[PDB]
Design an enzyme around this catalytic site. Structure first.
Site, PDB file in Angstrom:
ATOM      1  N   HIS A   1       0.837  -1.185   0.000  1.00 18.32           N
ATOM      2  CA  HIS A   1       0.000   0.000   0.000  1.00 18.32           C
ATOM      3  C   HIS A   1       0.882   1.249   0.000  1.00 18.32           C
ATOM      4  O   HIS A   1       1.927   1.259   0.635  1.00 18.32           O
ATOM      5  CB  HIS A   1      -0.937  -0.046   1.207  1.00 18.32           C
ATOM      6  CG  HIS A   1      -1.995   1.020   1.270  1.00 18.32           C
ATOM      7  ND1 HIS A   1      -1.875   2.189   2.002  1.00 18.32           N
ATOM      8  CD2 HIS A   1      -3.238   1.043   0.701  1.00 18.32           C
ATOM      9  CE1 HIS A   1      -2.994   2.900   1.844  1.00 18.32           C
ATOM     10  NE2 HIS A   1      -3.856   2.215   1.057  1.00 18.32           N
TER      11      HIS A   1
ATOM     12  N   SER B   1      -8.985 -14.591   0.588  1.00 18.41           N
ATOM     13  CA  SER B   1      -9.295 -13.287   0.037  1.00 18.41           C
ATOM     14  C   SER B   1     -10.784 -13.142  -0.215  1.00 18.41           C
ATOM     15  O   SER B   1     -11.450 -14.131  -0.475  1.00 18.41           O
ATOM     16  CB  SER B   1      -8.512 -13.043  -1.222  1.00 18.41           C
ATOM     17  OG  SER B   1      -8.940 -11.846  -1.848  1.00 18.41           O
TER      18      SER B   1
END
Ligand SMILES: [Ca+2]
Ligand SMILES: [Ca+2]
Ligand SMILES: [Zn+2]
Ligand SMILES: [Zn+2]
Lengths: 410, 410
Positions: A125, A328
């Protein structure tokens, strides 16, 4: 669409009714970002009457009395149990989000090892790289497998070319775009067998979304301070859901001594990035953990994985490139060509990928409304003799690509 | 007093009623910290139903649709007008508090001048020193006059011994303990006459409390980007009042280019310290500015100064050491010896000083309840033949000390 402020009712509570309408609409169609929009916190909105501020350390009461440390400390204790660290081994706090937790954990590691090289994957990120620059650390970007995981071969290669210095490492428990989970175990192992002992590396786990979710499965690389990790952060407004951004950072108590300083006018210590801190968040998160418990969360998590697998399956059957990683709720797919369609469903896009994150508010009925629209509109995008679909094999692997070439191979 | 979370009502809404009681009580007796507790925002608590997130730049809409940028940009425009910078000269955002604004403004200055020496007074907030350490800047602590102001002689001395390098400067518009206001004009002048031109220094103004308040007087050193300042921060939960910590940072647009990076998956830019951002705060601050305007605020400010002068006068007449700076609602006084009295009124203490900050919620009726109690209890603290009151002359000047020695001199 700015909203000018004028000197002195109707005009104002008129605006609230219109704004409330556009938010109801935006909430209906939101699919792209990892925010739980199923907010069940109506009884707590009384408390918006008080200026709650957990100013200072969560475990040392400041002289500012309007605070929520009872709740904050409850929540932190639960997280310590969740990640297996004992009451007298851990420190942490409720943050303003996953980026504050990242800045805190990376700062901790820089203080353990001021000469430390910092390592993270290319699919970290933007908060992680922002932190290294803010903190003037040397950042070594480690390569990534197709699916988003850190590449522990390229890791090893990079470790060995900086064998003098200690290693500071960020691991992505659920990367933003692809939803990958860095293999903690393998990373640890790779360090040990390049001659990094526990006292020459610090690991921070960025788990903004999936760090919360993963302890509710019996699968995958377990997040536990029984392994030599340094800190773990999570965002509370991601999975759990919270009207305002918040998070939880938990580290080893030994690690917090280098940041913690007494501040006499608080009658508390400053070991946080922030000063004043949201004291409503700890209550909101306390309410949620209590209502639902580890059983309620496990359910919500399993249904989110189920609903992501559904979305992925429906996309492949419509011959749309799509991938879903093991651990996920992030379904990566061919980036819609219609950017007004992207804005209507509030999809996050990078290159030729978009993604849907299947949060508790994201229902099968809603996924179907979306698949309907996407399929109708797709028919007008790639009709002969226009170019035909983009190839996502470089992004998601050719097993998951349904372009003109790769649809044949399966 | 932690509050354990157990697996699955009455027990929970029982707790809310008790907690709500202790908050009502704590709110009644709070005097020590600069938080406006007069919160008039009941209509906005509907919105706690939405996950508002202003994720990204306030002026570039991200694909996350549940946001409050209409409000945020309104509020920022008002602040730009307030500090005299035009729509196309300024950038800024609504922060999580005065410490985020400090971290942002100091980071901006480090990027304008990477080799820059950082200067602040000894009575800078702990956020300022935290930032320099986080950012690995060289911090030169400038001395302070008796009353808390930066000492621009010691400043000059320090400037000239680092004449090679550019200067990054934090100025305290209302220091935490004493309520002093650094003399901006004199600081500017001192730079110019040590041969620092506008292009070799950056000034950040920390105005967490008083930066909001000072433009509502016709007095004192005006905060205006017509002077060569770089950025100004304010806390919204200080004077304006907000249930959650927030603030406003405004800088020069030219300055923001070095931090701003495109983030493709937001379809926005990242020029903030944070990622996800509170989108309720911008609405709350918008509501307040609108209800009250520059006239409503000017009133509240003038009454807070009046009520501080009252408190100070009543304290001196009881022969209790006390000071109030010119441009201040912070009344510094002899630190109560009874630490349970300190905790009951939630006073901030440093050394032999405590202080009361007179915020809009702080009424004359409430100041009298406090003066009553303080005076009664003081009588048992310093009776012959116990030591007699501490001397605050070193802290607040001997004109303001009422110890056994200095009470005579006036
Ligand atoms: Ca399947
Ligand atoms: Ca007077
Ligand atoms: Zn392909
Ligand atoms: Zn004295």
């Amino acid at each position: 669409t700015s909203l000018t402020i004028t000197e002195p009712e109707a005009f104002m509570a008129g605006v609230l009714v219109r704004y409330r309408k556009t938010l109801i609409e935006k909430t209906k169609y939101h699919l792209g970002y990892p925010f739980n929009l199923d907010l069940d916190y109506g009884p707590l909105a009384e408390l918006q009457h008080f200026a709650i501020n957990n100013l200072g350390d969560p475990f040392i009461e400041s002289n500012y009395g309007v605070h929520s440390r009872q709740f904050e400390v409850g929540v932190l204790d639960w997280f310590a149990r969740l990640w297996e660290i004992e009451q007298k081994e851990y420190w942490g706090y409720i943050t303003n989000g996953g980026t504050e937790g990242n800045l805190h954990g990376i700062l901790i590691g820089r203080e353990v090892f001021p000469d430390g090289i910092f390592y993270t994957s290319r699919e970290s990120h933007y908060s992680i790289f922002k932190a290294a620059r803010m903190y003037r650390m040397e950042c070594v970007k480690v390569g990534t497998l197709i699916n988003g995981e850190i590449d522990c071969a390229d890791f090893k290669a990079k470790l060995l070319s900086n064998k003098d210095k200690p290693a500071i490492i960020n691991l992505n428990i659920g990367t933003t775009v692809k939803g990958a989970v860095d293999d903690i175990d393998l990373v640890i192992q790779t360090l040990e067998e390049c001659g990094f002992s526990h006292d020459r590396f610090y690991i921070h786990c960025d788990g903004a979304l999936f760090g919360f979710m993963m302890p509710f499965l019996n699968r995958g690389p377990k997040i536990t301070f029984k392994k030599p990790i340094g800190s773990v952060s999570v965002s509370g407004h991601k999975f759990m859901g919270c009207p305002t951004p918040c998070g939880v950072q938990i580290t080893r108590l030994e690690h917090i001594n280098a940041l913690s300083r007494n501040v006499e006018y608080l009658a508390s210590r400053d070991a946080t990035i922030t000063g004043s801190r949201n004291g409503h968040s700890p209550i909101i998160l306390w309410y949620a953990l209590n209502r639902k418990g580890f059983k309620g969360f496990q359910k919500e998590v399993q249904k989110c994985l189920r609903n992501a697998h559904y979305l992925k399956d429906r996309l492949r059957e419509a011959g749309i490139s799509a991938m879903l990683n093991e651990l996920s709720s992030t379904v990566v797919f061919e980036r819609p060509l219609d950017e007004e369609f992207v804005r209507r469903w509030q999809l996050a896009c990078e290159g030729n990928m978009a993604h849907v994150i299947v949060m508790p508010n994201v229902t099968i009925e809603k996924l179907d409304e979306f698949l309907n629209e996407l399929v109708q509109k797709r028919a007008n995008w790639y009709n002969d003799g226009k170019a035909g679909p983009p190839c996502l094999a470089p992004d998601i692997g050719s097993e998951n690509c349904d372009c003109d070439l790769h649809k044949l191979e399966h």
